[PDB]
Amino acid sequence: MIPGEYHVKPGQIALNTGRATCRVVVENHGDRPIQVGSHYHFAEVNPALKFDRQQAAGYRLNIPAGTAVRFEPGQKREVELVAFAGHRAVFGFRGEVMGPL
Amino acid sequence: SNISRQAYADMFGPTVGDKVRLADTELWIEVEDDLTTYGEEVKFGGGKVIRDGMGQGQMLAADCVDLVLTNALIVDHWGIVKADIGVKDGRIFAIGKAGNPDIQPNVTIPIGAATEVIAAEGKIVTAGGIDTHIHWICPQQAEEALVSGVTTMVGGGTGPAAGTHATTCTPGPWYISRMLQAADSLPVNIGLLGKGNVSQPDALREQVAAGVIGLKIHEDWGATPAAIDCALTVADEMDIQVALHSDTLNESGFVEDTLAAIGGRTIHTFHTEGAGGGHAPDIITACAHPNILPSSTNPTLPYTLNTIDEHLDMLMVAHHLDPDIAEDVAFAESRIRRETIAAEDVLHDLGAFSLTSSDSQAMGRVGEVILRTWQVAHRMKVQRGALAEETGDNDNFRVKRYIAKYTINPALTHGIAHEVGSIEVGKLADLVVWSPAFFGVKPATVIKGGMIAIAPMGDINASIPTPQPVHYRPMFGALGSARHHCRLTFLSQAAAANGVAERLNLRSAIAVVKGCRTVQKADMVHNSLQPNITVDAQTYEVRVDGELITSEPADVLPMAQRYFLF
Amino acid sequence: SNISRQAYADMFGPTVGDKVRLADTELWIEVEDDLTTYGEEVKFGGGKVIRDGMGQGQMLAADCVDLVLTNALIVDHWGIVKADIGVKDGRIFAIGKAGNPDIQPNVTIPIGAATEVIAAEGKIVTAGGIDTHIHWICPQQAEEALVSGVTTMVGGGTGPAAGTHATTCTPGPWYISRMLQAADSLPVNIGLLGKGNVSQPDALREQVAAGVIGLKIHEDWGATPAAIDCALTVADEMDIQVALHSDTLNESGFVEDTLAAIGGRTIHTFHTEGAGGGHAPDIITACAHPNILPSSTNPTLPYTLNTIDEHLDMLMVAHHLDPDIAEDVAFAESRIRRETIAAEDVLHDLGAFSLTSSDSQAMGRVGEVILRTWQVAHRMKVQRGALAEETGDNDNFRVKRYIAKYTINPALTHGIAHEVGSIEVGKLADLVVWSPAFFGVKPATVIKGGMIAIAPMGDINASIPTPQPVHYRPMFGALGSARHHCRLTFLSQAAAANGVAERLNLRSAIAVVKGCRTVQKADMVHNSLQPNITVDAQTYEVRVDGELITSEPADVLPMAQRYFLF
Amino acid sequence: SNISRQAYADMFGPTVGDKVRLADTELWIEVEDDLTTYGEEVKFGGGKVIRDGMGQGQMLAADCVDLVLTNALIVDHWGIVKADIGVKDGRIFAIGKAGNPDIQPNVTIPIGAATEVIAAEGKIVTAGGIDTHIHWICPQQAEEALVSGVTTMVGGGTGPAAGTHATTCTPGPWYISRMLQAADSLPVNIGLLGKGNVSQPDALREQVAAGVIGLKIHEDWGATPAAIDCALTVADEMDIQVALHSDTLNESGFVEDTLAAIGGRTIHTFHTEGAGGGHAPDIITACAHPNILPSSTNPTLPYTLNTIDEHLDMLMVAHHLDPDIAEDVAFAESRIRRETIAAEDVLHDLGAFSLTSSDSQAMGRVGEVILRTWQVAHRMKVQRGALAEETGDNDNFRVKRYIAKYTINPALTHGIAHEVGSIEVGKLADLVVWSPAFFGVKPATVIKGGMIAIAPMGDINASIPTPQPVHYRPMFGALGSARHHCRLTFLSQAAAANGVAERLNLRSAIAVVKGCRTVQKADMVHNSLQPNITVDAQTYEVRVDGELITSEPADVLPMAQRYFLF
Amino acid sequence: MELTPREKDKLLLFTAALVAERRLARGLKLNYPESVALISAFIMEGARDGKSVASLMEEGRHVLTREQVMEGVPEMIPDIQVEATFPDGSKLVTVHNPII
Amino acid sequence: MELTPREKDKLLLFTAALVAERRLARGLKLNYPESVALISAFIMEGARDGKSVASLMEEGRHVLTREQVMEGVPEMIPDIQVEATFPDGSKLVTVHNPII
Ligand code: NI
Ligand code: NI
Ligand code: NI
Ligand code: NI
Ligand code: NI
Ligand code: NI
């Protein structure tokens, strides 16, 4: 007996199903680490991260909500992106879009 | 991508099909539904989801909620579901999926710059409790009840006076006015009961016109057929509720005479089992009638090994009885019956008794209404097994039946369900957040009208709010003008129209009671059973359809020694 | 039928001829009269008398009282009687026989649906105490005094500032206004004293016009003949009282010079014995004059074995004196005289000293005014025997003489007797209920303006109000708006007319002082003696008509170690 | 006549040339000037100077002060001098020589009948502290801070909610209105910060129009260039301040990108060292810019042996981070750097960092802002010796530089210096009296708006205020209406014009913020240094003009174990 | 710990009992408040041990005798009542005439 | 003494720990609040002695074992946190999984 214990049924949860995704190779050319969140508009991340910003337009990291991907200086890696939904309107970040798309 | 169910539960709380143990009881609840879109859950914190352009949108205050409880596991009479809860203008805005419509799908609860966040992942959220049997013996009772998870208190009294020690009555216009004014200082919703024991209608109408939302008929003031008829007549014309504590002495008649005096009119019977007061030994037979809304007070809940022993002296002090006066001790004894006490737990499990209350400091414990209700559920599961209504391998239905006893049913009985009593859109945002390990015992956060009113708080000078000692302390929702804005003082329709709030210069929000005459047993959520119940005059045995109703006394109970320092 | 006297006392409290011991002292009181009709006493509880159609009638609120204290043993300056007390609209309605005129005889206090009940059988009820020597050093003093049984506090101060530490003065319009506003937060009746030490009339008139009900002349601010004359002149025109702490140093003259400066005008002399301040060593000779209303502060009451020893350092701190400065220690010493301290107790017993007060936190204990007054009575009975005025084998007269010292006499002296000070019809219902075993030490209930404001209260979560721990907690009468309605802020006639209450937006009820100039020694109830008293300049011996006045120091006192935890 | 210097100091406090040790530190202050006339000092008490016709004059209230602090040793950014302080209408009237012009020379502060006296001889008096980094997690924080000597609290929050646990934001009009109403109940001056993280201007304008005096940009809500630009644009038009907690993750850019987004506009950078949040590892380089007003939060002050060890878990709880999530623990670690923590103390000593604050219950201790500021000064004197600016054999300049960090500089940064922040004529009388042995640790008296609000108080029932137990208790200035009159609720100019105070029915005095856009680093009193500072990306080493900046961790600190019970 | 108001209230009773305990140990005759606190605290620990209400109602009358308290004290305490969390929840123990 | 609010708050923790201490001494298996108070009070005294934060973070995990507390209690206490005045000022001690 453990007070308030969970009895989670075994298995897995499929995340962001039925949505467009794409893989991109990213490389940190800066001298300081960069960490990106699950819902940040990938195309507007820190300028030191080198990748195809054009392909990442309207996309975010395809990772569980609230988690992140870290890039140490000089680190190169391939990430999977998932397209934004809702109105597909991007406001904020580095102020590059500030509207639909 | 993909994530395992266990890791998922650790991050966002359980989902469909997962079960959770309620505190240290044997009751398990299973998540019935989850209103989220997997991968789009909102989470707040460093580098999380609720950030500008991401989980937070660009809308003005008018188009977003003031507060969101993220990933909450709701337990209410209508379901046990996982969802986000939005609160706007101190009221429940919506139960759904929160976030930013700009980039997320299925958002029904928009989060913007004007939105505060309460992280409920891994927590159970319920409506605030409603205790309708309060004896206003001291103001300290409000904090005790609030800390337990009770946000509305209905009762009567003027302080530690003999009349209030014994009865839930705030006698007359002067005392009623005084208590309505004092109520602004307390962090709970309040409604008052007047003294209904009189055979002159106008003496009752004055009290209702002064502000009471109900009338208490008590035997200590004379629970005679004449007084009962008078109170019910006035109640029928002013749309207020009558609470009854019948003639234990059978002085004016037996239970059948009282029932006849009531004449099919709506009435709330307090402590229907009898120990707290009522026709000896069969007042319990009242739960068979359609016009009777029956409740229990808490000391007899549930039947345990020490129950009987502690009742005699408790009885005496509460009613100003003299242990040296033989007649005084004989009538105290006739109220304490092992037979009816044992049956009461089963009648609750069957839905024959529809409410639980305290009877604060007059044969009842103000901070134990919720706790004892769950102990009864546990003891009943242990003894009787699954209810006929259960579906699946969980106790979901029994949980919905019991939670209704201190939330929606008391609200319906007293005509305040339009304002409080459940987690439904438009109702006042009185919510209680619990950690599963402490469910029903010690809340994590108590919210009143959209503001946190009390919560456990650690060292004030610490670097974080968690360091010891951690104990319950009043928050901003319990302070001055913010409090006034987050609590309600309930008035009768007549008082509201008479301008009582303006005359007394009441600072809190005002709510009016209505629908007290039209509620009947059939309206009690999940607790509408009207059994063919009988009590043996000699043996006191309780039978339903001829079968004997009984249970065994507990030697040890959950939600007890594992949580309390004393 | 018939009932034995003992059984009768156990049920309804003592009656005519029965005697009761006051706490653990040697003082016994005998019931002088009983206003009941045997067999028709009202009692509340399960199956008792106060029930519909029985002890409770059918009248509307306007025709019955709001509260009744049943079977109370009243102890007041006018008598020690057994009766029911009716309270209506926050004021004393009547002292008589309560019940229902419909079936009972001789009912003068009608009980109806609008009536609350306080059971006083076996209890002693007195008026609330009045302390007229308060130093507003901290707000916590009000709760301490209320718990002791004192319901009215007159004094001055602005908090823990040097000026207030030493004197009872709220200096000027700004501080006066601020303290009047702060007073709404305290559960006692309050009246303020301004700084009367000035030789410019207008500087005093401003303070009176701002709200003070009196002016304190203190030596620390210069108690010179000029200042004294100025204050008395303004007092004579504005109908306010002057309290005096004379020139201990004899710097401007001796006691005869001060008396001459006073010139036969009414004045209240604080701590007339001298230890608390005053012409050394003969300030005590003031009690011989007709225009002097003399009081004592409490540390010297009564003369005990440890009295002298504790006074020196107490003196120093209270007046900001330097123990390294020879002149500072010499003048501290000249104030502490065994001779005058011993005489003071006897002068109280004779009625030469008419009031007792505290001198809170400035050479006095705020929670010990009542307690010490009774200890003096005990020590005097033990030493001097029965007073010449005693009739019968009881201490009734000595009890009436001493109770007047902290109730009616302070009220008369300060012009507030029309509102408070005794249990008489029309006066504010400030009452204190005591159990005989704890009389003068720890009250059972303290009532302010018709509402219970503080009382001992047990476990808040308990099934009854009696379980431990039991300690004093604020009740509804001490809460927000109910408090405002149950307390009084006393103002000078000029302030009342100037609209000070409206300007400062005072929330509490307002009362005006009057009759401060016309009271004289002859008006002090049971304490109007003007003895031909003399003090020997060299030996400090006090003599009245040539006979030496003195007493012996107590080694042990009642109302001490048997009741307190520390 | 003549008097020795030692005897003089014992009676009136030190004078020109005398030195005093600050608590148990190695810091000594030397009296720079004394505004008295030897022989004419005012002293209150039995037979002292402040008496009618002597040190007290005949003027009306309008021509004399309401309160005088006699013989005070003032420690402020402008000087360390001995003088009398006059307070009139809740504000600082004058700093000079008090007394009666009728018989004394050079009197600039007239004492009359309307004057209260606070004896400050032998005591140090300072302005009340101002903490601009408050997380309104619980109301109890106000008493903790007031007791420490902080009289103004600027921050944001709604209670113990996740959003407030992590950020100083009161989200939107509803919560802002609620907190403004709750603020009337607290005994400190209050100003609120709204959530500035949005890229839609109108969502910010609504919050400012609702009452906030500033906007907090926090990384937990998204500290992106777009959000930062938006907040600064609105700040520039509404004259409110912006407080920044930058993007630690370097997610949107590095420190140079944020600085570019700021674009030379005025901004207050919270915890500029970085442990509390900010671009890793070089957020500290911001102190080089003219438009940046840099502050430190208190847990890293000063660098001690246990500093690093306690930071990791503190970091996690404050930001809702998961220790099981690798990325969550990696970013927590990158914030804790021995290199920047050691450099921070030196940067304060040099005047590169201009403010100290708490970061209450979210990586900061509310009652330790003052205490830690002095511990840093001590550790810096011990390590670096005298500052280049010191004159004479004392630490006067270092003392003026450090006191400015929690008084005038925070006031300037937030646009409230016209009301509070220093002891200058016309400013609100928020003063703190200290005994030299307890300087910066435990105050003797805390004055709010001319009234004592909290102070150590002994036994309430004692004969004097000094007997044990002595602990901090609320005084009259913290009570009801007196409190409202002695505190300020700061509003934005827009809110003031919109009638927010009338609409919400705010009872306290209102003050408006102004001059938030025009302050720059050069305006910070004694702390205007803009060093050419660099941080090594790999080693984290901090260098100014190429030289390495560092210090050694303390094993033992003053103002610690000698004063606290726990 | 998450101490509720009632748990904190009982800490006052426990502390009051520590005071009495030390005094009884010195050989002093206990006064009114000391006696009430000592017997009350005794009952609370009994409940923590798992004793029944019935057993405590009896045992409580044997904590202090008339010779261990001041004169008049036994008569000032006709009964003592205290509640505590028993294994089966909160229960009320009433000890009649505890001192004899 | 001039006790601040925080010093008075810690007196509550100290007293709660005295209760637990006496019960542990009787041989009872401690409950949730008793366990938290006992370990917390232990750490506060450690700081008064002059022990480092690092040493206490370790020592705190050896005050109570799984066999000295009630079932489920170890899982109800994933960590304990308390602050006290160390020789170098106030510091926070966090003891992870104190009971094993
Ligand atoms: Ni009842
Ligand atoms: Ni009841
Ligand atoms: Ni005096
Ligand atoms: Ni005095
Ligand atoms: Ni921050
Ligand atoms: Ni912060």
Short mmCIF file of N, CA and C in Angstrom, two decimals, chain C residues 136-141 144 158 160-164 171-172 174-175 178-179 185 195 197-200 202-203 206 219-222 251 314 319-320 328 361-368 507, chain D residues 44-46 48 50-52 56 58 60-61 66-67 89-90 112-119 449-452 455 457 459-466 473-476 479-482 485 507:
data_model
loop_
_atom_site.label_atom_id
_atom_site.label_comp_id
_atom_site.label_asym_id
_atom_site.label_seq_id
_atom_site.Cartn_x
_atom_site.Cartn_y
_atom_site.Cartn_z
N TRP C 136 -1.20 53.85 25.71
CA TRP C 136 -1.30 53.13 24.44
C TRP C 136 0.07 52.85 23.84
N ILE C 137 0.80 51.94 24.49
CA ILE C 137 2.14 51.53 24.09
C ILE C 137 2.08 50.49 22.97
N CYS C 138 1.04 49.67 22.97
CA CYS C 138 0.87 48.65 21.94
C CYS C 138 -0.60 48.27 21.87
N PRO C 139 -1.09 47.88 20.68
CA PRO C 139 -2.50 47.50 20.58
C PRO C 139 -2.88 46.21 21.29
N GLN C 140 -1.90 45.34 21.52
CA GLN C 140 -2.13 44.06 22.19
C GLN C 140 -2.73 44.23 23.59
N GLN C 141 -2.55 45.41 24.19
CA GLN C 141 -3.10 45.69 25.52
C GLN C 141 -4.62 45.53 25.58
N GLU C 144 -5.62 41.89 26.18
CA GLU C 144 -5.23 41.50 27.52
C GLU C 144 -6.26 42.00 28.54
N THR C 158 0.77 56.82 21.40
CA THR C 158 0.85 56.71 19.95
C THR C 158 1.57 55.41 19.57
N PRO C 160 4.84 52.53 20.89
CA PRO C 160 6.06 52.47 21.70
C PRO C 160 7.05 53.60 21.48
N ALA C 161 6.63 54.82 21.80
CA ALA C 161 7.47 55.99 21.67
C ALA C 161 7.79 56.47 23.08
N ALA C 162 8.93 57.15 23.25
CA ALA C 162 9.34 57.62 24.57
C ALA C 162 8.28 58.42 25.32
N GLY C 163 7.60 59.32 24.61
CA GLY C 163 6.57 60.13 25.22
C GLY C 163 5.43 59.32 25.82
N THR C 164 5.01 58.29 25.10
CA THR C 164 3.93 57.41 25.53
C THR C 164 4.38 56.40 26.58
N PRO C 171 -0.33 63.37 21.74
CA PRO C 171 0.00 64.74 21.36
C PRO C 171 -0.53 65.27 20.03
N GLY C 172 -1.38 66.29 20.11
CA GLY C 172 -1.90 66.95 18.93
C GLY C 172 -2.87 66.28 17.98
N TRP C 174 -2.95 65.57 14.69
CA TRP C 174 -2.57 64.51 13.76
C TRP C 174 -2.56 63.16 14.45
N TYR C 175 -1.83 63.04 15.55
CA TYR C 175 -1.79 61.79 16.28
C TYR C 175 -3.14 61.42 16.88
N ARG C 178 -5.23 59.99 14.11
CA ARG C 178 -4.70 58.67 13.77
C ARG C 178 -5.13 57.59 14.76
N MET C 179 -5.10 57.92 16.05
CA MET C 179 -5.48 56.99 17.10
C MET C 179 -6.99 56.78 17.16
N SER C 185 -10.46 49.39 15.31
CA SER C 185 -9.95 48.04 15.22
C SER C 185 -9.91 47.31 16.56
N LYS C 195 -2.19 65.91 25.45
CA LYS C 195 -1.12 66.43 26.29
C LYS C 195 -1.57 67.78 26.84
N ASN C 197 0.05 69.65 29.10
CA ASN C 197 1.15 70.49 29.57
C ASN C 197 1.53 71.63 28.63
N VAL C 198 0.83 72.76 28.75
CA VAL C 198 1.10 73.97 27.94
C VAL C 198 0.50 75.16 28.68
N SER C 199 1.06 76.35 28.47
CA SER C 199 0.56 77.55 29.11
C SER C 199 -0.16 78.45 28.10
N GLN C 200 -0.51 77.88 26.95
CA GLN C 200 -1.22 78.57 25.88
C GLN C 200 -2.50 77.77 25.65
N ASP C 202 -5.12 77.92 23.59
CA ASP C 202 -5.45 77.48 22.24
C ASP C 202 -4.81 76.16 21.85
N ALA C 203 -3.60 75.88 22.35
CA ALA C 203 -2.92 74.62 22.04
C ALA C 203 -3.67 73.44 22.66
N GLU C 206 -7.33 73.04 20.65
CA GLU C 206 -7.16 72.33 19.38
C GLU C 206 -7.26 70.82 19.58
N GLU C 219 4.38 65.40 34.93
CA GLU C 219 5.63 66.07 35.31
C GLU C 219 6.75 65.95 34.25
N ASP C 220 6.76 64.85 33.50
CA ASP C 220 7.77 64.65 32.45
C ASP C 220 7.66 65.71 31.36
N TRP C 221 6.48 66.32 31.23
CA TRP C 221 6.26 67.41 30.26
C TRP C 221 6.18 68.75 31.02
N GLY C 222 6.41 68.72 32.33
CA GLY C 222 6.36 69.92 33.15
C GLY C 222 5.04 70.18 33.86
N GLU C 251 9.95 70.85 42.39
CA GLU C 251 10.68 71.87 41.64
C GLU C 251 10.00 73.24 41.55
N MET C 314 11.79 49.30 37.92
CA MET C 314 10.55 49.50 37.18
C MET C 314 10.40 51.01 36.97
N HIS C 319 10.41 55.95 33.25
CA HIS C 319 10.62 57.38 33.10
C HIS C 319 11.92 57.84 32.41
N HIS C 320 12.60 56.90 31.74
CA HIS C 320 13.84 57.19 31.01
C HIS C 320 14.91 57.82 31.90
N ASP C 328 19.09 61.23 39.36
CA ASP C 328 18.05 60.40 38.77
C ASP C 328 17.67 59.25 39.70
N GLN C 361 1.94 49.12 31.33
CA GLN C 361 3.31 49.10 30.84
C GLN C 361 4.15 50.34 31.14
N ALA C 362 3.75 51.10 32.15
CA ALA C 362 4.47 52.30 32.57
C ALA C 362 4.30 52.40 34.08
N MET C 363 4.61 51.29 34.75
CA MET C 363 4.49 51.07 36.19
C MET C 363 3.08 50.56 36.52
N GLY C 364 2.63 49.56 35.76
CA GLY C 364 1.30 48.99 35.95
C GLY C 364 1.03 47.80 35.04
N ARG C 365 0.14 46.91 35.47
CA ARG C 365 -0.18 45.70 34.72
C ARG C 365 -1.61 45.72 34.20
N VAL C 366 -1.75 45.85 32.88
CA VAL C 366 -3.03 45.96 32.21
C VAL C 366 -4.06 44.85 32.45
N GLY C 367 -3.60 43.64 32.71
CA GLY C 367 -4.54 42.56 32.92
C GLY C 367 -4.80 42.28 34.39
N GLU C 368 -4.34 43.16 35.27
CA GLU C 368 -4.50 42.93 36.71
C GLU C 368 -5.23 43.97 37.56
N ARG C 507 -15.96 54.36 11.93
CA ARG C 507 -17.02 53.38 11.73
C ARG C 507 -17.81 52.97 12.96
N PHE D 44 14.08 63.94 26.72
CA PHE D 44 12.77 63.75 27.33
C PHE D 44 12.82 62.76 28.48
N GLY D 45 12.01 63.02 29.50
CA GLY D 45 11.94 62.15 30.66
C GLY D 45 11.66 62.94 31.92
N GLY D 46 11.64 62.24 33.05
CA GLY D 46 11.38 62.90 34.31
C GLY D 46 12.41 63.97 34.62
N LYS D 48 13.56 66.27 32.67
CA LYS D 48 14.49 66.54 31.59
C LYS D 48 14.23 67.89 30.91
N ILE D 50 12.53 68.54 27.62
CA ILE D 50 11.26 68.76 26.91
C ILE D 50 10.05 68.89 27.83
N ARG D 51 9.90 70.09 28.40
CA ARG D 51 8.82 70.42 29.32
C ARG D 51 8.32 71.83 29.04
N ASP D 52 7.06 72.08 29.36
CA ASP D 52 6.42 73.38 29.13
C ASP D 52 7.28 74.60 29.50
N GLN D 56 9.96 72.78 25.37
CA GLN D 56 8.69 72.72 24.66
C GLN D 56 8.08 74.12 24.67
N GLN D 58 5.10 77.23 23.16
CA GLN D 58 3.67 77.56 23.22
C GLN D 58 2.94 77.62 21.87
N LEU D 60 0.97 76.64 18.26
CA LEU D 60 -0.15 75.79 17.89
C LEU D 60 0.40 74.65 17.05
N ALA D 61 -0.41 73.62 16.86
CA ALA D 61 -0.02 72.43 16.11
C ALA D 61 0.57 72.76 14.74
N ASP D 66 4.83 67.04 14.54
CA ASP D 66 4.02 66.03 15.22
C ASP D 66 4.91 65.03 15.96
N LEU D 67 6.12 64.87 15.47
CA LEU D 67 7.04 63.90 16.04
C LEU D 67 8.48 64.34 15.89
N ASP D 89 2.87 65.82 9.38
CA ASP D 89 1.92 65.33 8.37
C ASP D 89 2.38 64.03 7.71
N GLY D 90 3.09 63.20 8.46
CA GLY D 90 3.57 61.93 7.94
C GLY D 90 4.80 62.05 7.06
N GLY D 112 6.17 71.49 20.44
CA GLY D 112 5.06 72.11 21.13
C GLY D 112 4.17 71.06 21.77
N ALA D 113 3.00 71.47 22.24
CA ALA D 113 2.06 70.55 22.88
C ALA D 113 1.66 69.41 21.94
N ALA D 114 1.63 69.68 20.65
CA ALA D 114 1.25 68.67 19.67
C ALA D 114 2.38 67.75 19.23
N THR D 115 3.52 67.81 19.90
CA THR D 115 4.67 67.00 19.52
C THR D 115 4.94 65.74 20.34
N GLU D 116 5.04 64.59 19.66
CA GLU D 116 5.37 63.32 20.32
C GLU D 116 6.90 63.20 20.23
N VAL D 117 7.50 62.45 21.15
CA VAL D 117 8.94 62.29 21.17
C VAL D 117 9.43 60.85 21.14
N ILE D 118 10.42 60.61 20.29
CA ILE D 118 11.07 59.33 20.17
C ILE D 118 12.54 59.65 20.50
N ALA D 119 13.06 58.98 21.51
CA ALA D 119 14.43 59.20 21.95
C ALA D 119 15.39 58.37 21.10
N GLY D 449 5.10 56.17 7.55
CA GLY D 449 4.31 57.37 7.37
C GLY D 449 4.11 58.21 8.60
N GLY D 450 5.08 58.21 9.51
CA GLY D 450 4.96 59.00 10.72
C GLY D 450 4.40 58.26 11.94
N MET D 451 4.02 57.00 11.77
CA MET D 451 3.51 56.20 12.88
C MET D 451 4.34 54.93 13.03
N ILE D 452 4.58 54.49 14.26
CA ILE D 452 5.33 53.25 14.47
C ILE D 452 4.41 52.12 13.99
N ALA D 455 7.51 46.88 16.12
CA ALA D 455 8.64 47.07 17.01
C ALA D 455 8.72 45.89 17.94
N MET D 457 8.39 44.02 21.28
CA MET D 457 7.53 44.33 22.42
C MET D 457 7.58 43.19 23.42
N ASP D 459 6.47 41.48 27.38
CA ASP D 459 5.26 41.05 28.07
C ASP D 459 4.20 42.15 28.07
N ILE D 460 3.05 41.86 27.45
CA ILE D 460 1.93 42.82 27.36
C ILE D 460 1.33 43.19 28.71
N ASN D 461 1.37 42.25 29.64
CA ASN D 461 0.83 42.45 30.98
C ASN D 461 1.89 42.97 31.96
N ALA D 462 3.12 43.14 31.50
CA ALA D 462 4.19 43.59 32.39
C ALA D 462 4.04 45.02 32.85
N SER D 463 4.83 45.39 33.86
CA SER D 463 4.80 46.72 34.42
C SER D 463 5.53 47.71 33.52
N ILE D 464 6.36 47.19 32.62
CA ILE D 464 7.12 47.98 31.65
C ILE D 464 7.13 47.21 30.32
N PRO D 465 7.51 47.86 29.20
CA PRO D 465 7.52 47.16 27.91
C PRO D 465 8.71 46.26 27.62
N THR D 466 9.70 46.29 28.50
CA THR D 466 10.94 45.52 28.34
C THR D 466 11.03 44.05 28.81
N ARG D 473 5.93 42.67 17.29
CA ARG D 473 4.47 42.69 17.26
C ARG D 473 3.99 43.96 16.52
N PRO D 474 2.88 43.85 15.77
CA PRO D 474 2.29 44.96 15.01
C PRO D 474 1.84 46.08 15.95
N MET D 475 2.09 47.33 15.57
CA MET D 475 1.69 48.46 16.39
C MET D 475 0.53 49.21 15.72
N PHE D 476 0.15 50.36 16.27
CA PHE D 476 -0.97 51.12 15.74
C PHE D 476 -0.89 51.52 14.27
N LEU D 479 -2.58 49.08 11.96
CA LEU D 479 -4.00 48.83 12.21
C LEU D 479 -5.00 49.59 11.35
N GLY D 480 -5.96 48.84 10.83
CA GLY D 480 -7.05 49.38 10.03
C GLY D 480 -6.84 50.68 9.29
N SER D 481 -7.65 51.68 9.64
CA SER D 481 -7.59 52.99 9.00
C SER D 481 -6.32 53.79 9.22
N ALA D 482 -5.63 53.54 10.34
CA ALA D 482 -4.39 54.27 10.59
C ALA D 482 -3.37 53.78 9.56
N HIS D 485 -3.74 55.28 6.09
CA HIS D 485 -3.23 56.64 6.09
C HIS D 485 -1.71 56.72 6.11
N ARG D 507 -8.50 52.29 -0.17
CA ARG D 507 -8.52 53.14 1.02
C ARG D 507 -7.22 53.86 1.35
#
